[model samples]
Target: PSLATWTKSLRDQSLEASIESLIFLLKRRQVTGDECAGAIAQLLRQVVAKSKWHDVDQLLYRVQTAGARLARAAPHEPVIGNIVRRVLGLIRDEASDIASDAASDIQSKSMFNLLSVQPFSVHALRSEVMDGIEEILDEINQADDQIASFAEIQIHPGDYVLAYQPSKTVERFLVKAASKRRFTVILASLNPQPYAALRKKLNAAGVSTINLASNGLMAYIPRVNKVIFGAKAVYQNGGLLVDSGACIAAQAAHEYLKPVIALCGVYKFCPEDPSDEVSRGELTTTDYIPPDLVDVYLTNLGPQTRHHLGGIYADHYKIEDIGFSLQV
Candidate 1:
């Protein structure tokens, strides 16, 4: 089965089937636990890794849900959360080490060169530590509480625009939203091939397709007008983390000087920025060449990837960015 199938099954709580499929898929390729572990780690790094420090609340919520799902499905593995905690910690530590090393070579480096950095900045390091500790505590508390109470939260029509990659889940959500006429969904991408597939799907379903990438980034560009939250919460230093194509998107919008916002409500606040660490938001060969025909795009990593042009231009505030309004 495709990765999408696995993710969907997991999301839908088809535990037995999901487990069976997971084992079958893994066993078929003789995938080792370490490989599985790496894949999981990469996924987290893209989402809640150091890159997520700026948007810790949103990332944390996603992580919490994922963790809770794992725990609930494998109650026998009471230590599943602990295992996740350790693995995530390792990924962060390693990534921080790499990013710190890369920082020493900036001139020859594109913001992308931060990969070789040795130790992540003190800010990101501290933030990540606090995030991990808090997340662990939250996860432990969730063992008895049903988290994801906010996943059901929906915005009003025109409350905000919904822009997402053209994936099955996105398609499904957009189609549903269209029926309700509650939100405008923009399949934002420079490439037209996958979008062509989406168009084909729309044509098959008698849905009209429009080209929006050419329209530009502005409300005047009705076809593509609207801004959506980026995935990564960029750092004060211009380091950002987003899903793979996010860099291009952010750069495009940045050129127009359009405001770049991140809807980081779920993940908790971290003390540092993620871009300070290598591997926190880097993509893999899998991103460019998917093992399967279809996959889910989870993190807001695309624009987050363009930390220099996108996040680097921002004036990132300190702990104040963390609900400064709540300073009581």
Candidate 2:
């Protein structure tokens, strides 16, 4: 089965198989960053729902172990670690919330029975947990469209926009946003796969598309209006880990006094120290760009500066608040 099909059929596979399937997909780069994370989270939810656990501690141990295994399988894909942490954090929040509710009703129920009270059926808890994950998936799916709305305002008609190593999401945004406007999209050769696909889409959308080698970026920077790049992670320190050659493009954009935007979702932001040696080993730092080079981030919350990202992150998301109303 394909990665997408396998991801959707999580309930049909054993947890071990699911993890291995994800690892295989990641190792081969079969899916996008967000898709990989969503699949992993979905599989974890199913595993948790099916398993029998005596206490929160046991559940935590098993979940953490599984997460570590998945992350180890493909350390280069840091999105795996991000989803793992989110899943573990969600489990903790769910347990704490249930325990708090049980404590509040201690007087009505016998104090001795309070400790014995079950939070919810495994089925019910799973439903809730999966719902939250589905919410995150929805946000990921709609992220491009949401950010596309700002393209017209952010990008003027007839302006030249430079995109280096454009991911599928960035391609979609460019197609949708540049269709009505008269904008020229310059693509750097770092994105070999799907380069032709992007050109076709832009051609059909009425946006001029130019494909050039990485060395051509600086020469064109003077004429470019804005520079956009896809990011793997946006750290707490406001640095962005992007595709190779992105740092050079950002550097060129800075030299030309152009606005360089990193299009990322709220989920991509991490509090973990990107400078940690262990993390550095897992993720490549060759293309990392500091906050100073990037002018702002186009996120699910709209365009935000590096300084504003910290504040919005605090008020916007939490493990408990995760999940969508839609059925997956």
Candidate 3:
């Protein structure tokens, strides 16, 4: 039963513990629907009570359940197994890191018990949730073997290629893949002013590059045939919340259905959709460039391709549409 006393509800009830328990279970093996329902409900309670925003967190909860459902329904293929493993690992690490702080704050001893439980949700009965922590490290470690397999697979010339920017960890991995085909990968700059230095670094690394204008919109023009933006998070319905320029650029891409390939490491997965109050929505920007100079807004995912650069498009098209097509 739920706690009734105000202080007990606030301090003794274990929303954090429930969340941590779910994270552990997800990492070990696929979850049953009954488990997914209970875990998701608890996650919602945690987000609704503690977060400044709730809608996005709700969306995340949906995406997580959907991902889990998809995993359970699919054949036990190796790649699918890997995706499930990666997803679980990400959730485990993130939940554990945050729940650690919560554990110290909680009054109930059961909070600790929840975190310590093994065979948590999907884990092998004896395994601790900590085993899920290796998802990303393992993913990166195996990227080479995966890419080698990718090379053997038939790839069309213009078929979307991997592109990432700004993060050194991402840059290192993306550059390696781009080198394979002398692929012309465009990286949106995090800092526009220091582009010369940025170019130098790419040159040193043997990577090709292009710069988005100060307005961050002009980069969508033809100098580069296609654009790929990084993403902060995505909604379950398929709209994405990305950098400030994303909404505009994604709208434009819809005019052509030009592939707005999303390049992500999988860790960026959020159970909450960005539109939810909890989802970190559009980044606030104080840059005051004249709006007229804006041409194209870009995101890691491409446009709806049906309504490019039109105002009505943004209204009709949900932001979640931005990520429905993006790949890991």
Candidate 4:
């Protein structure tokens, strides 16, 4: 069957050939949805694992350039861009995590000097120990609500709020904060189906909702204080791929000098370049929002910029422990 041949190409074909085959499949609508996207990402992982490169930067370049080409080939399929960006994120995470681990290991073992042994005060040490224990306990119990608290601090009373696609995670925090801050809520969905879904959620929460037409979203941007979005994936460069209206929202934000904030868990971060012309339907190219337009990524780790993502990942996750190697 043709499907079998296509699968074989994904596994055995050279990088360029394999990329071309994927473009063929995507253009023809042979594969669909997240499964197709996951397959494309897995193939990219294989490409990264198998390719020979002198250094990490070269590997990043190869993936970015190749991903850009793949995107250009089929602009209608964002899954291609999504997967490529995620693969790049993995590579970036591994390198930074490994290096940070090594640095911390070395610092712990060698930073203390034998020649200058300064005696620490017993009372001070005891107080410090108690403080650390209390901090850990507080963090454990409060971790789930931390993002909500952070959002509350960032959002002020009487501010206008606009959010796209009401996901449970980010909206829970925003809604809790909105209830507390008494901000006006305006929700926009890219499709009629999702618009109905968004309205039901907002109505149940007792918040007033304004539904904006899909095409005419920019008109509402100038009046809003902040634009919040849910992310499909976050590129290490601080760029993000969000729902359909996000690029327009961000572009509008840029024009109006308003801030765009993406709320996501740390797991959504991909340490990859998202500056590729991936194929999608007529309305899809705008899904990719560059880092410049985005102001902050609000994750469980708190608000962070794209530049600090590598460090944040390095601090929390280790490289050698997680296997990113793909079998051909």
Best by TM-score: 2
Error of 4 at 206 (Å): 4.7
Tens-digit lDDT track of model 1 for 101-198: 65443422333334424223433544465465455444333321121122113323543342544433345434544444444445554333446765
Candidate 4: deviation at residue 205, Å? 4.4
Ranking by lDDT: 2, 4, 1, 3
lDDT of each: 0.37, 0.70, 0.37, 0.60
Error of 4 at 44 (Å): 20
Residue ranges of candidate 4 with Cα displaced over 4 Å: 1-146, 193-206, 275-286, 317-327
Top model number, lDDT: 2
Question: Candidate 1 versus the native: TM-score?
Answer: 0.33
TM-score of 2: 0.82
Residue-by-residue lDDT tens digits, candidate 2, 45-157:
76676665645566656666677776666666666666656666666665554425765444323424434353333334556666766666676678778877777767788
TM-score of each: 0.33, 0.82, 0.40, 0.52
lDDT of 3: 0.37
Off by over 4 Å in 3: 1-128, 135-170, 183-198, 205-207, 274-328
lDDT of 4 by residue, 95-213 (tens): 44222486543433342533214212222222333343333334323433666668777678777788876565556776677556666677776655455664565566655667677
